[PDB]
């Protein structure tokens, strides 16, 4: 199927004393594989999946070099942004950046992304063609002009179409045992009587990977959204994901209700019924 590599960076200024707290994480699809945390002792980019440990000393030295440089860029950015927005030296502020690439089933470039936020709001982002910028306000417009003059988009595009996909492909092969495995949801239904008139049916999907999934209810073969509750997909903590959807039904009418499950790891959609 399709795959992605994404990196996420968060810097939080610490007014009063010292440099920002900087945390970088790298993912292939829904699997974290590297991290850097400025508060940690190593001051190295660190492995977070077994298949990246195959990489040698030169890899780790390079990633560390680059990620430390990254933290310094964000440190500078925080000062600049405070000036752009005429904010005091007193408050804590946040910069976030995410970038990455998607490949399709052919493992060839589909899409690239590079976006930046200040204090949780859109600041500047590369457009889909990787040739120009979306700037949210006049501060970001000044950044846009700067980055245009410096031909930033060109160099970013080169990485996103080149290095990004090349290394994603590498990781997919090296981590094939888990990265290329689909774990179909393990499903079951529960029942709880709220009173002698009303019952709750809950349809569970557990232990699935990747995280993308759809769970829906039908009543007599037609979609049912009224009287339903669907929780956000959540990490199990072992690399897999969990989700449930519930419906309130008249006690005794459970048989009308069916749960429907769609996931990459299922050849055809699943249908569950109460028994």
């Amino acid at each position: 199927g399709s795959h992605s590599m994404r990196y996420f960076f968060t810097s939080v200024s610490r007014p009063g004393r010292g440099e920002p707290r900087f945390i970088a994480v790298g993912y292939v699809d829904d699997t974290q594989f590297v991290r850097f945390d400025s508060d940690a002792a190593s001051q190295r980019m660190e492995p977070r999946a077994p298949w990246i440990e195959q990489e040698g000393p030169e890899y780790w030295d390079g990633e560390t070099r680059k990620v430390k440089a990254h933290s310094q860029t964000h440190r500078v950015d925080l000062g600049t942004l405070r000036g752009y927005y005429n904010q005091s030296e007193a408050g804590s502020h946040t910069v976030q950046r995410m970038y990455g690439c998607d490949v399709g089933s052919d493992w060839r470039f589909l899409r690239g992304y590079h976006q930046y936020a200040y204090d949780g709001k859109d600041y500047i982002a590369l457009k889909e063609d990787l040739r120009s910028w979306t700037a949210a306000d006049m501060a970001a417009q000044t950044t846009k002009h700067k980055w245009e003059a410096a031909h930033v988009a060109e160099q970013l595009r080169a990485y996103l179409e080149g290095t990004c996909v090349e290394w994603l492909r590498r990781y997919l092969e090296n981590g094939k045992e888990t990265l290329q495995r689909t774990d179909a949801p393990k499903t079951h239904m529960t029942h709880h009587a709220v009173s002698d008139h009303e019952a709750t049916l809950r349809c569970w999907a557990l232990s699935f990977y990747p995280a993308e999934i759809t769970l829906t209810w039908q009543r007599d073969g037609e979609d049912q959204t009224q009287d339903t509750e669907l929780v956000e997909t959540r990490p199990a903590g072992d690399g897999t994901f969990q989700k449930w959807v519930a419906v309130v039904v008249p006690s005794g009418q459970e048989q009308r209700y069916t749960c429907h499950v769609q996931h990459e790891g299922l050849p055809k959609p699943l249908t569950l019924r109460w028994e």
């Binding site: 390079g62 990254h70 950015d77 942004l81 600041y123 950044t143 700067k146 980055w147 410096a150 290394w167």
Partner: peptide, 9 residues
């Protein structure tokens, strides 16, 4: 593999 070139805003 993270991007090896940087620019400030």
């Amino acid at each position: 593999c993270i991007n090896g070139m940087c620019w400030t805003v």
